[PDB]
Amino acid sequence: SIINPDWNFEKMGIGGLDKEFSDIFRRAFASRVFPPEIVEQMGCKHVKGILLYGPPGCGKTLLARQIGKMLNAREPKVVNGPEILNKYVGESEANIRKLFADAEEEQRRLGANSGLHIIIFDEIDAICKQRGSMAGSTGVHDTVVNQLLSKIDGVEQLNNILVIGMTNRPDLIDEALLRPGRLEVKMEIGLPDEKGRLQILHIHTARMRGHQLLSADVDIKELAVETKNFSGAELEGLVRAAQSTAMNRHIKASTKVEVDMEKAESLQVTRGDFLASLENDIKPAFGTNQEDYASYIMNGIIKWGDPVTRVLDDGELLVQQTKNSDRTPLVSVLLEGPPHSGKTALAAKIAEESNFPFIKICSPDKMIGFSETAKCQAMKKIFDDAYKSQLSCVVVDDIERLLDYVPIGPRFSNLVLQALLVLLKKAPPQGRKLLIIGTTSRKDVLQEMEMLNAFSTTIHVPNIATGEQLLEALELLGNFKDKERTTIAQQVKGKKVWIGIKKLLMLIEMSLQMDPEYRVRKFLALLREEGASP
Amino acid sequence: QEDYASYIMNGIIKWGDPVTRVLDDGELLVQQTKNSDRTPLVSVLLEGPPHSGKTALAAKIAEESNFPFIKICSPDKMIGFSETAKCQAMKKIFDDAYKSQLSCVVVDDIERLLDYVPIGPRFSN
Ligand SMILES: Nc1ncnc2c1ncn2[C@@H]1O[C@H](COP(=O)(O)OP(=O)(O)OP(=O)(O)O)[C@@H](O)[C@H]1O
Ligand SMILES: Nc1ncnc2c1ncn2[C@@H]1O[C@H](COP(=O)(O)OP(=O)(O)OP(=O)(O)O)[C@@H](O)[C@H]1O
Ligand SMILES: Nc1ncnc2c1ncn2[C@@H]1O[C@H](COP(=O)(O)OP(=O)(O)O)[C@@H](O)[C@H]1O
Numbered sequence: 001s002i003i004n005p006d007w008n009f010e011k012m013g014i015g016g017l018d019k020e021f022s023d024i025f026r027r028a029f030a031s032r033v034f035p036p037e038i039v040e041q042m043g044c045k046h047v048k049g050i051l052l053y054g055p056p057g058c059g060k061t062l063l064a065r066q067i068g069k070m071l072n073a074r075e076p077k078v079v080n081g082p083e084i085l086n087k088y089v090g091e092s093e094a095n096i097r098k099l100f101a102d103a104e105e106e107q108r109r110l111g112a113n114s115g116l117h118i119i120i121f122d123e124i125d126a127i128c129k130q131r132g133s134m135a136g137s138t139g140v141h142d143t144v145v146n147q148l149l150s151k152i153d154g155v156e157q158l159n160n161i162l163v164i165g166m167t168n169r170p171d172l173i174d175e176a177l178l179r180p181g182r183l184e185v186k187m188e189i190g191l192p193d194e195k196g197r198l199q200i201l202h203i204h205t206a207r208m209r210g211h212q213l214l215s216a217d218v219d220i221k222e223l224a225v226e227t228k229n230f231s232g233a234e235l236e237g238l239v240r241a242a243q244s245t246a247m248n249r250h251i252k253a254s255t256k257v258e259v260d261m262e263k264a265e266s267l268q269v270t271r272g273d274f275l276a277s278l279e280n281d282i283k284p285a286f287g288t289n290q291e292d293y294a295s296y297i298m299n300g301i302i303k304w305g306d307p308v309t310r311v312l313d314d315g316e317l318l319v320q321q322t323k324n325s326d327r328t329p330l331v332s333v334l335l336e337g338p339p340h341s342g343k344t345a346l347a348a349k350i351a352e353e354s355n356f357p358f359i360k361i362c363s364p365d366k367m368i369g370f371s372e373t374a375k376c377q378a379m380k381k382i383f384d385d386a387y388k389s390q391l392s393c394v395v396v397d398d399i400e401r402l403l404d405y406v407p408i409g410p411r412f413s414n415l416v417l418q419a420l421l422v423l424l425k426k427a428p429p430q431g432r433k434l435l436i437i438g439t440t441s442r443k444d445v446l447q448e449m450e451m452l453n454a455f456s457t458t459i460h461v462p463n464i465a466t467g468e469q470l471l472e473a474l475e476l477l478g479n480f481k482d483k484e485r486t487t488i489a490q491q492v493k494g495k496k497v498w499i500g501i502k503k504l505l506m507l508i509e510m511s512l513q514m515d516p517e518y519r520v521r522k523f524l525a526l527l528r529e530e531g532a533s534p
Numbered sequence: 535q536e537d538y539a540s541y542i543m544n545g546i547i548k549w550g551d552p553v554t555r556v557l558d559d560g561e562l563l564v565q566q567t568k569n570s571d572r573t574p575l576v577s578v579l580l581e582g583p584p585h586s587g588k589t590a591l592a593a594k595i596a597e598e599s600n601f602p603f604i605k606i607c608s609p610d611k612m613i614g615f616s617e618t619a620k621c622q623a624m625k626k627i628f629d630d631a632y633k634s635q636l637s638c639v640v641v642d643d644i645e646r647l648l649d650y651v652p653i654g655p656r657f658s659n
């Protein structure tokens with residue numbers, strides 16, 4: 001026994017994970033606390049390694065270091081995954097072998113009284129003959145893995161080691177590396193919650209409070225509730241950014257105004273710096289991104305008719321259904337209409353109004369020149385990230401362009417289609433929800449490919465089909481005068497109008513390039529030339 | 535005993551006679567494959583319209599057999615794989631199945647393993 005019966009994890013660095021320690025200690029390290037006499041009388045062996053997995057930057061290395069410290073072990077021998085890899089034949093095995101030399105030597109000399117040596121891996125999934133199954137070429141000359149196993153067990157036995165593996169992709173771990181006698185205790189370190197964020201923020205700001213540098217205006221609960229899906233490292237980044245911004249503001253103000261030494265000595269950070277840094281500096285990876293919405297809804301939403309309200313209300317109903325419901329944790333929907341009807345903007349608005357913590361948009365604008373396998377990898381990565389949050393929402397921008405559909409042929413990619421069909425019918429882990437929104441202009445082709453049988457609902461986005469609707473749209477936009485509007489109404493009362501909003505904006509912009517006299521006739525000619533008749 | 539509770543998500547309610555017929559046929563097939571001597575290999579195919587409840591009944595039939603080896607091969611654990619990887623995975627499952635004295639294997643959604651699409655048609659040979 002070297003640690004108190006209930007252990008202690010607080011104000012020692014790691015602050016967010018206090019239940020994890022108890023779980024792991026109960027499950028794995030019960031032999032090293034009991035009096036050695038009884039353990040030797042029973043005749044049992046200790047666990048020879050554990051595995052940790054979770055999102056990056058959530059405090060895994062700290063846990064391993066503290067576990068090593070609490071067991072009275074020597075200095076950990078850190079190592080990285082990609083670092084142990086070399087193209088020369090029979091060189092990675094050497095790197096794997098050099099790590100255990102000290103343990104072997106001490107076992108040889110001291111016999112059965114040596115201490116404890118702990119090896120901490122990192123990105124252990126890099127060396128594995130399972131990533132090769134996925135489309136690619138990372139065979140890593142399988143031999144490597146075998147060598148590692150031959151050192152954890154085999155004919156020659158080592159009884160004074162402990163291997164802690166850490167990974168982010170728990171689905172690429174070789175299955176032979178989890179049998180009894182090897183790494184045989186798995187654990188999860190997920191994102192923090194309100195209390196965890198509060199504790200982390202309290203810990204990381206303890207220095208200033210001692211020296212009265214921090215202002216009395218700032219709270220810590222407000223900043224704990226404002227940050228929704230922040231991880232451990234982003235809070236430290238936020239604190240550093242606040243420090244830098246406050247310092248820069250203070251120096252600039254002192255230079256601008258010859259303030260007395262009373263305030264010059266003071267370097268209070270206040271709360272404005274924290275809010276400014278939070279809203280401008282840090283961009284979470286597992287949270288909402290308010291910058292990208294303005295890249296799709298460029299001119300907002302204007303109500304020119306009833307259909308817009310219908311679509312928005314149906315979206316609200318779907319969001320409410322997915323939020324609070326059991327027996328149905330996955331919901332899908334599809335928006336369909338003719339080209340230039342404004343489907344992407346409406347989808348973005350529906351997603352934004354949901355107030356979910358995790359919102360993402362998967363569009364083909366960021367996949368130029370990609371092979372189909374890379375597209376599959378990106379889609380799967382987006383969905384994998386979505387699966388690590390309590391409430392999520394994913395938008396697929398264009399389903400026809402993701403498949404590479406061309407009417408001649410026809411031609412398309414089958415791998416992406418099958419991946420989408422599989423992913424649309426896979427529920428998240430227990431206790432979590434999801435929502436998916438589609439978008440397309442060719443419903444018939446999707447129906448012919450048996451893809452409309454996977455979605456759960458469908459919505460229709462119509463165009464402008466009456467003169468008064470066009471007049472109302474122009475009035476809301478505000479680009480034509482009074483007599484101009486009278487002339488437009490007189491010439492468009494015929495009611496033979498069928499246009500899309502995007503095309504309407506383009507036509508107005510083109511028509512407004514002449515002197516005020518000839519605008520009306522040019523606009524009317526352009527509109528008339530587009531005389532569609534469904 | 536985690537796959538069965540993951541595939542039968544809402545139990546099995548009896549809304550009519552057909553359920554009993556399906557379960558009885560499954561039981562008879564299981565008894566045949568257990569008690570026979572000149573027919574060690576048996577197969578069966580469950581078909582019907584979409585959204586009819588094919589996977590739940592198959593999982594229930596497999597679970598109610600009490601065989602010491604049971605495995606399910608679904609396509610949702612092979613996202614992004616190529617043809618060779620699928621072949622290797624299926625062959626590995628069957629090879630493991632061959633080392634026991636009593637086994638049962640479930641193959642799910644045969645039409646998604648071949649990558650069928652009515653246009654073309656296209657699939658994996
Ligand atoms: N009521 C509205 N509904 C939709 N878009 C609107 C509305 N009012 C204004 N807009 C603007 O019209 C444009 C809509 O174009 P959008 O990108 O949504 O078209 P689309 O249907 O996706 O086109 P494409 O066929 O090129 O994919 C955006 O600028 C949007 O801001
Ligand atoms: N008597 C029943 N038979 C089948 N499923 C039932 C029954 N009672 C309840 N259920 C539930 O209904 C759902 C049936 O969906 P299931 O996954 O079996 O569909 P499926 O036939 O595989 O569909 P798909 O055509 O989409 O592949 C499951 O939740 C199952 O638990
Ligand atoms: N639970 C936590 N409590 C306090 N700080 C944390 C916590 N988790 C992560 N950190 C901070 O994150 C950084 C270290 O991240 P690290 O432990 O390497 O995580 P990972 O191995 O997942 O990247 C340090 O700034 C550390 O203070």
Ligand SMILES: [Mg+2]
Nearest residue numbers: 343344397398
């Ligand atoms: Mg679009």
Ligand SMILES: [Mg+2]
Nearest residue numbers: 588589642643
């Ligand atoms: Mg099925």
